[PDB]
């Protein structure tokens, strides 16, 4: 394809995907052994290595539902990928969610039309795989990292013309605003694979508190430990 | 209210709700001790008793999203109910789902407009509470009952003018078609409570197999054992 | 053979009155009809057949909301040969000039349900009653000396609506009562080639909170039933 | 004055018949009314006032389509005090049992326009006629010996539709005629607190392709006009 | 042979100027063309053909609103061989920097109609003009010394809108004028493989309340006509 | 969070491909005195001169949600007046061929973004007229045949509704890409100007495809046209 210049075999059966290809590089270099770069078309870096002896890939998916939908579809159909774990950032709308909290999207709401296009303009509930979600919760408990599990909201406009929607999201308990989960979940169902999104809170939409671009690139490590350990728990169940 | 003729305290903090009030009567009489009838307005029978010493209520919610939304809302706001477990029936679209299989709706798709009305016409992912879902999966393992966990589809028209939509549901891995879960999940989120739907497959939309009215009323009991045992798991943290 | 109705063909009259509440159906049958038999009780959704002034009449609950009544209406028509359904409901008022216990006739029913969009290529289906059944009801009310208003109902999906401002829009557009069923019954009647009408008694005022008791709703809205039954006789004789 | 009507208050009767075609309005005024004066001609949209059997009546074109007729109907109601509008239209049939020159009465009007969604918070507004006006029309037809059907019209935005399959849906749902205006007139009437009814003569059959000529539509659809005018007299007399 | 146009193939030029108002079409033809003949008068929708500087040109009313103009535009294209339509309309301004009598050129047209959703599987169809026709109009305006703005129109279905707040949105997004047709004409031109452009003169200012008279709209918006006619000659000579 | 540059680092005109490596190629190949001004998330951006005139080029990533972020921030935070997207697209018409250049006077879409801006009505996502004319005139001067008309900005490359391509073809859509309608909505929202010019990299019907290297470094016509169009705009 125009998007992935790898050969079949180059990816593991599980791929962790941040939006930022530079965070994918940092993740692979910091957590994995015997790392090879396996993709670089359009600068969208992907890598394969081992974590505690288990093959794991890590590859950026870019920002937004249309970008990540391409990469996730191709990994599943063209490279045999079974599980995708998005390891993202997100913005908090709830006053009881703080910067650097880790949130797990058992569901993802969205203002995109992509799932309506798949589902005859009805409401498709964009959900994670249950066992992957359980694995992540159990991994977080073993690492002593607090998590909340619930709904994300995958937005199409970061610079939204309707900020009042944040109040609606908050009323409905949305844990974090990001731009991808509902898309990845729709692709996973469409093409018969499994996915989960875990995010670290990088911005507070109410308070204005934020992290730097450097922090987002190299500093959200709890979520990656949880993600990797969750894979091992899923293998051994 | 016009729908419930009970006093606060008459209901437990957890209520199991089938659509059929006669199934509610059967559940209470068969599984609970010291049962009392606490509601009978419009014939929508509700009961309260104990299960292994633990206070539990069971009450009908009627058919369809508009019916069950009324009862779920009132139990939460007027009677202090913290958890609702819908114990329903459903129609299968998948070739690997059989009559009497028990399915757990971690999400519920829908063709209703009710969540759009709540959510500014965007896609609200109607999801169960994660811990209640985990409790149900764990209770099923302990009871030796096979389950599948994933998406239900809550339909507004049992007699649908669009049977092709079943093919779409199948392609997206929908485990069962019922008429309520998405509405119950929307209410639970709106009013700050927790819910889960567990259903027994009563019809197969592809094979044409159907159970009788009597079977639906009194024979789908694995789901009830799972529901009740899941409550006890939830209490024990 | 259906999961919803445990009757045999023949058990229902060609005209069925339908309240949402099966206990109201029981009260209607026992109060207004002779030689009554119970003909359905699956899911507690009581139905009955008797005679009114010698004419066969059935009365059966349809439950709350469009998805509930759609199932029962469809089955009565296709499986039991029912020609006419008259919903005999309650409703909540939004207009200042509509009062508790007024009787309102839904020539049309607006809705916030998606069911008619599903039937009609996502366009606007005008959910309307049968014209002659509507005329029969107006004439029967006139003959009884009971005032009625004839116009639009609004069939809501959420009794506990997250958008109460919509009641203002309903009032501005002259909606006579809010209930939860008419637009669904009208869509089923058109889909399956039968006739329907919804008549409702105002049981609540949505602006003021004025309310009737559960017992009042179940046994006490009699004018609408006399109007419904007499309207059937007018229709037979026309 | 508005850009659309160059008449003075008082120039219109409290009842206005409205065909889409200003030349049919001219025909109606010349053929059925006495003491006629022309009261509007802006944009060629001819309107007239005279008397029928002594009763003041106006007749004015509304143009083709919902956006055109919405402008005229609103202004007549709010600026000229009009109480009742009877659209006297043509329509295209989709049913086999509906034939050229049949008269149909639109107790409701479905639509593929977005205008009533704009008025009604994107829900389904059931665009309905006034009940008494409808009854008056049905009764007048009976007195004139003209067979009518009473039911749903479908008010299309696109005469040359990109979705002819929709006609099959219309036919299933018993749609009596396809025109382009009623649902818009009924929305305006409700919005601004007046009463309206649409009566149409079948001028095309969508299935057989048979079409009446322009001249036949302009000056030959007498039954619907006789029905409309007599229906007004019925409405006056309770 | 259509119900809407009583003309023969060849009666129309390959280019037709279309205002909404048939009386403006008459004024345009009589004022600007030589050897004029009337070629349509069905429904009072006057159409004419003559020459401009020796070049055959037609001018015909399209009526108010998308459904009206969609019928005439389609038939001109498919039945009379028309290749270009230039709508020469009026519009209402929402911007503070747009004044009465300004000429605006609609390289695009937004809309609240459902017609393009019906053509385009309920997605967003960008209703655009033909580029070269747009260029020709800009260049003709420069040659005629007439200031123009080129950008988006908004084609409304409800002149009497229940949502005046939308004007604030239009203004934010730079909408140059509110009219009722352009999006519909552009949708038909794309559907049937022809070319269109809408040029409008500001007749009302929605914020200041300034309004031109019916007479002004009919006969005084002539800069846009000079631009339209000269733009055709440029298009021929490219 | 997305751009690590100071005010003044971008020219008033920015060319934007989706591919940051194509941005690098454009800067290296067509501009002088180039410096890299952004690299956050790998989304490379550069500023240099074309025939003496200051010009920037920066990737926008794939899809409406990605490019809407970059375009917004360039306008509001970096004072950018004109954005010219220099993209690829897939053809659906039989008379549109690989390597053909197409100019999006308008962009249709299946995204909800403009509905969210425009009270759920139809916003006609259009280019700036003069930028469009400049590009057409520049193409004529370069002797490059262009078609000018509607693009279609898709949200799903791997669409579940391939029948829609038939509808696009009927309606004359020149190319399918994933960005224009979003960039045009942002430009209107924040009061700037934009145009999309694309090279056909795929034929959606025939299956003809250019390689990834071809997309990255061989679509020169559209770049020459974009840069020359800027000079025409300066001088008109
Ligand atoms: O405030 C926000 N709104 C929407 N998404 C995010 C995210 C998550 N990301 C990061 C990135 C946009 O900065 C896109 O991939 C989605 C962090 N903060 C926010
Ligand atoms: O085939 C089906 N379609 C939709 N729902 C159900 C259900 C679940 N219920 C049972 C009941 C309708 O029979 C309503 O409460 C939803 C079982 N089978 C089906
Ligand atoms: O305030 C109201 N909102 C909606 N419906 C009703 C009705 C009519 N019914 C009664 C019942 C809900 O109480 C449902 O079947 C529709 C009475 N009051 C109201
Ligand atoms: O075949 C049809 N389709 C839609 N409308 C009409 C009508 C009614 N009119 C007549 C006119 C278009 O001819 C417009 O005002 C609506 C007659 N025939 C048809
Ligand atoms: O304020 C306005 N709103 C909508 N359209 C127009 C127009 C343009 N026309 C004129 C005519 C309505 O007066 C219809 O054909 C559209 C001028 N002013 C306005
Ligand atoms: O076949 C296609 N469908 C949708 N977009 C494109 C494009 C244009 N791009 C390239 C890139 C996806 O390959 C995204 O930025 C939009 C080229 N070919 C196609």
XYZ file of N, CA, C and O in Angstrom, chain A residues 23-122:
400
model
N 6.497 9.293 19.531
C 6.233 8.530 20.758
C 6.343 7.036 20.463
O 6.813 6.279 21.298
N 5.977 6.602 19.256
C 6.158 5.189 18.926
C 7.637 4.812 18.982
O 8.012 3.766 19.503
N 8.477 5.679 18.446
C 9.936 5.481 18.512
C 10.455 5.435 19.955
O 11.261 4.557 20.314
N 10.017 6.389 20.771
C 10.418 6.421 22.164
C 9.977 5.151 22.891
O 10.746 4.546 23.640
N 8.720 4.760 22.674
C 8.208 3.534 23.304
C 9.063 2.319 22.938
O 9.502 1.567 23.818
N 9.316 2.130 21.640
C 10.048 0.955 21.179
C 11.466 0.943 21.754
O 11.939 -0.081 22.254
N 12.129 2.094 21.717
C 13.502 2.200 22.200
C 13.622 2.062 23.718
O 14.610 1.529 24.229
N 12.586 2.456 24.438
C 12.654 2.479 25.887
C 12.192 1.163 26.523
O 12.724 0.752 27.568
N 11.198 0.514 25.907
C 10.570 -0.682 26.503
C 10.922 -2.008 25.845
O 10.800 -3.048 26.486
N 11.314 -1.986 24.569
C 11.529 -3.235 23.825
C 13.001 -3.568 23.578
O 13.840 -2.667 23.484
N 13.289 -4.863 23.457
C 14.598 -5.348 23.032
C 14.617 -5.729 21.560
O 13.580 -6.045 20.979
N 15.808 -5.677 20.964
C 16.036 -6.173 19.611
C 15.109 -5.479 18.604
O 14.446 -6.115 17.776
N 15.064 -4.163 18.700
C 14.083 -3.382 17.936
C 14.554 -3.198 16.513
O 15.751 -2.954 16.301
N 13.640 -3.390 15.548
C 13.846 -3.002 14.137
C 12.790 -1.999 13.719
O 11.626 -2.165 14.086
N 13.163 -1.013 12.888
C 12.170 -0.110 12.309
C 11.595 -0.849 11.112
O 12.356 -1.419 10.324
N 10.272 -0.921 11.036
C 9.597 -1.682 9.975
C 8.708 -0.836 9.067
O 8.277 -1.300 8.006
N 8.405 0.397 9.471
C 7.694 1.273 8.566
C 8.224 2.678 8.656
O 8.499 3.161 9.772
N 8.273 3.382 7.529
C 8.512 4.827 7.616
C 7.863 5.682 6.539
O 8.171 6.869 6.428
N 6.999 5.077 5.729
C 6.256 5.828 4.721
C 5.469 6.979 5.373
O 4.884 6.811 6.429
N 5.519 8.165 4.756
C 4.881 9.369 5.271
C 5.387 9.731 6.663
O 4.722 10.445 7.400
N 6.561 9.236 7.036
C 7.086 9.549 8.364
C 6.372 8.787 9.495
O 6.608 9.075 10.681
N 5.486 7.849 9.147
C 4.673 7.170 10.163
C 5.402 5.945 10.710
O 5.161 4.806 10.293
N 6.344 6.225 11.611
C 7.307 5.242 12.096
C 6.630 4.050 12.758
O 5.740 4.227 13.588
N 7.038 2.834 12.389
C 6.646 1.656 13.150
C 7.824 0.731 13.418
O 8.810 0.748 12.694
N 7.733 -0.045 14.500
C 8.873 -0.788 15.034
C 8.357 -2.116 15.533
O 7.173 -2.240 15.935
N 9.255 -3.093 15.548
C 8.959 -4.395 16.157
C 10.126 -4.814 17.033
O 11.293 -4.615 16.655
N 9.817 -5.356 18.207
C 10.849 -5.785 19.158
C 10.248 -6.836 20.054
O 9.195 -7.379 19.726
N 10.882 -7.102 21.192
C 10.302 -8.005 22.196
C 10.147 -7.345 23.562
O 10.965 -6.503 23.966
N 9.094 -7.745 24.276
C 8.892 -7.331 25.663
C 8.822 -8.595 26.496
O 7.968 -9.464 26.256
N 9.798 -8.742 27.397
C 9.926 -9.972 28.177
C 9.809 -11.189 27.276
O 9.119 -12.146 27.604
N 10.452 -11.118 26.113
C 10.555 -12.255 25.200
C 9.390 -12.422 24.235
O 9.419 -13.287 23.346
N 8.368 -11.596 24.405
C 7.153 -11.676 23.602
C 7.212 -10.638 22.473
O 7.547 -9.474 22.714
N 6.934 -11.050 21.238
C 7.027 -10.115 20.112
C 5.940 -9.031 20.223
O 4.793 -9.335 20.504
N 6.321 -7.764 20.059
C 5.387 -6.634 20.175
C 5.772 -5.621 19.106
O 6.962 -5.320 18.939
N 4.788 -5.078 18.394
C 5.068 -3.909 17.537
C 4.522 -2.598 18.108
O 3.599 -2.598 18.938
N 5.076 -1.471 17.640
C 4.598 -0.156 18.035
C 4.694 0.768 16.823
O 5.740 0.844 16.180
N 3.578 1.394 16.477
C 3.524 2.207 15.257
C 2.564 3.359 15.414
O 1.485 3.194 15.983
N 2.971 4.540 14.963
C 2.069 5.710 15.016
C 0.841 5.515 14.124
O 0.885 4.774 13.109
N -0.271 6.167 14.477
C -1.463 6.106 13.626
C -1.907 7.472 13.119
O -2.917 7.557 12.426
N -1.193 8.525 13.528
C -1.547 9.909 13.137
C -2.756 10.444 13.898
O -3.305 9.751 14.759
N -3.182 11.673 13.594
C -4.249 12.276 14.397
C -5.567 12.087 13.678
O -5.713 12.409 12.496
N -6.535 11.568 14.409
C -7.916 11.610 13.953
C -8.389 10.296 13.389
O -7.600 9.472 12.929
N -9.703 10.144 13.370
C -10.313 8.905 12.922
C -9.916 8.502 11.480
O -9.566 7.342 11.241
N -9.969 9.428 10.505
C -9.629 8.982 9.151
C -8.174 8.479 9.003
O -7.917 7.521 8.231
N -7.237 9.099 9.733
C -5.841 8.649 9.647
C -5.704 7.259 10.283
O -5.229 6.302 9.637
N -6.179 7.109 11.518
C -5.909 5.840 12.229
C -6.692 4.691 11.595
O -6.273 3.550 11.677
N -7.831 5.012 10.980
C -8.639 3.967 10.341
C -7.877 3.301 9.207
O -8.103 2.113 8.934
N -7.105 4.088 8.451
C -6.298 3.481 7.370
C -5.288 2.505 7.967
O -5.176 1.363 7.507
N -4.501 2.952 8.941
C -3.400 2.119 9.431
C -3.964 0.873 10.107
O -3.423 -0.220 9.947
N -5.046 1.037 10.858
C -5.585 -0.118 11.627
C -6.156 -1.141 10.655
O -5.996 -2.362 10.832
N -6.862 -0.663 9.638
C -7.435 -1.585 8.640
C -6.293 -2.410 7.997
O -6.374 -3.636 7.893
N -5.260 -1.725 7.521
C -4.166 -2.404 6.825
C -3.397 -3.382 7.725
O -3.024 -4.490 7.265
N -3.172 -3.005 8.980
C -2.484 -3.927 9.913
C -3.275 -5.198 10.089
O -2.724 -6.287 10.040
N -4.592 -5.077 10.207
C -5.424 -6.255 10.386
C -5.481 -7.096 9.099
O -5.257 -8.299 9.144
N -5.820 -6.490 7.967
C -6.069 -7.302 6.757
C -4.818 -7.715 6.006
O -4.778 -8.780 5.366
N -3.782 -6.892 6.081
C -2.597 -7.101 5.252
C -1.440 -7.651 6.060
O -0.576 -8.293 5.495
N -1.455 -7.450 7.380
C -0.345 -7.938 8.203
C -0.748 -8.897 9.313
O 0.070 -9.229 10.182
N -2.011 -9.311 9.297
C -2.477 -10.352 10.205
C -2.567 -9.959 11.673
O -2.578 -10.843 12.565
N -2.579 -8.658 11.943
C -2.659 -8.197 13.319
C -3.987 -8.573 13.981
O -5.065 -8.428 13.378
N -3.884 -9.118 15.197
C -5.026 -9.623 15.950
C -5.544 -8.624 16.988
O -6.726 -8.619 17.286
N -4.633 -7.857 17.589
C -4.959 -6.930 18.687
C -4.261 -5.598 18.424
O -3.052 -5.581 18.136
N -5.012 -4.498 18.522
C -4.436 -3.178 18.520
C -4.732 -2.521 19.880
O -5.875 -2.519 20.335
N -3.706 -1.994 20.528
C -3.927 -1.183 21.722
C -3.464 0.237 21.417
O -2.241 0.504 21.305
N -4.424 1.162 21.331
C -4.068 2.560 21.144
C -3.570 3.040 22.510
O -4.194 2.738 23.537
N -2.421 3.726 22.521
C -1.814 4.268 23.737
C -1.701 5.773 23.520
O -0.717 6.270 22.907
N -2.770 6.479 23.913
C -2.956 7.850 23.443
C -2.854 8.869 24.558
O -2.564 8.542 25.722
N -3.090 10.122 24.182
C -3.361 11.160 25.176
C -4.864 11.503 25.108
O -5.588 10.997 24.255
N -5.338 12.346 26.015
C -6.710 12.806 25.917
C -6.883 14.040 26.779
O -6.029 14.342 27.639
N -7.945 14.792 26.502
C -8.294 15.960 27.349
C -9.456 15.677 28.277
O -10.462 15.100 27.866
N -9.356 16.143 29.531
C -10.370 15.818 30.535
C -11.463 16.873 30.519
O -11.158 18.075 30.450
N -12.728 16.437 30.595
C -13.858 17.355 30.773
C -14.441 17.258 32.187
O -15.121 18.181 32.662
N -14.204 16.134 32.859
C -14.733 15.943 34.214
C -13.817 16.634 35.214
O -12.603 16.565 35.089
N -14.396 17.325 36.188
C -13.561 18.033 37.197
C -12.788 17.066 38.133
O -11.757 17.448 38.713
N -13.254 15.819 38.238
C -12.608 14.794 39.084
C -11.564 13.933 38.325
O -11.012 12.976 38.904
N -11.287 14.266 37.069
C -10.200 13.636 36.333
C -9.021 14.616 36.236
O -9.234 15.794 35.943
N -7.806 14.160 36.530
C -6.625 15.040 36.632
C -5.590 14.755 35.545
O -5.563 13.652 34.977
N -4.733 15.740 35.273
C -3.582 15.541 34.384
C -2.839 14.286 34.810
O -2.590 14.069 36.005
N -2.430 13.512 33.811
C -1.666 12.286 34.007
C -2.462 11.077 34.521
O -1.894 9.964 34.620
N -3.773 11.240 34.783
C -4.607 10.055 35.045
C -4.605 9.145 33.813
O -4.583 9.620 32.681
N -4.682 7.836 34.051
C -4.833 6.868 32.953
C -6.281 6.420 32.878
O -6.876 6.033 33.925
N -6.827 6.459 31.655
C -8.222 6.132 31.431
C -8.321 5.058 30.370
O -7.501 4.987 29.435
N -9.260 4.147 30.587
C -9.450 3.000 29.676
C -10.832 3.079 29.036
O -11.852 3.172 29.742
N -10.857 3.110 27.706
C -12.083 3.273 26.950
C -12.765 1.962 26.630
O -12.574 1.375 25.548
N -13.595 1.482 27.555
C -14.415 0.326 27.210
C -15.387 0.669 26.072
O -15.741 -0.199 25.254
N -15.768 1.949 26.001
C -16.549 2.463 24.881
C -15.961 3.786 24.382
O -15.164 4.452 25.087
N -16.326 4.165 23.156
C -15.933 5.492 22.667
C -17.130 6.105 21.929
O -17.560 5.584 20.903
N -17.657 7.193 22.461
C -18.652 8.018 21.764
C -17.929 8.761 20.649
O -16.684 8.779 20.595
N -18.679 9.425 19.781
C -18.039 10.173 18.694
C -19.012 11.114 18.004
O -20.243 10.894 18.021
N -18.474 12.179 17.404
C -19.254 13.065 16.543
C -18.890 12.865 15.067
O -19.311 13.618 14.178
N -18.139 11.803 14.802
C -17.827 11.417 13.430
C -19.022 10.741 12.798
O -19.872 10.181 13.515
N -19.079 10.747 11.462
C -20.099 9.988 10.748
C -19.633 8.583 10.356
O -20.397 7.881 9.704
N -18.393 8.187 10.708
C -17.849 6.925 10.112
C -18.651 5.668 10.495
O -18.890 4.787 9.654
N -19.088 5.586 11.734
C -19.846 4.387 12.143
C -21.277 4.400 11.627
O -21.823 3.347 11.263
N -21.845 5.595 11.461
C -23.133 5.670 10.752
C -23.011 5.162 9.334
O -23.940 4.547 8.820
N -21.872 5.427 8.701
C -21.683 4.947 7.324
C -21.599 3.410 7.277
O -22.008 2.785 6.248
N -21.045 2.809 8.330
C -20.917 1.326 8.433
C -22.250 0.673 8.820
O -22.479 -0.503 8.513
N -23.107 1.420 9.512
C -24.211 0.794 10.279
C -25.609 1.350 9.908
O -26.479 1.523 10.772
N -25.800 1.675 8.621
C -27.089 2.122 8.095
C -27.664 3.306 8.865
O -28.883 3.410 9.045
N -26.756 4.189 9.299
C -27.109 5.445 9.958
C -27.798 5.246 11.308
O -28.462 6.146 11.806
N -27.639 4.058 11.884
C -28.025 3.807 13.261
C -26.902 4.049 14.272
O -25.814 4.522 13.898
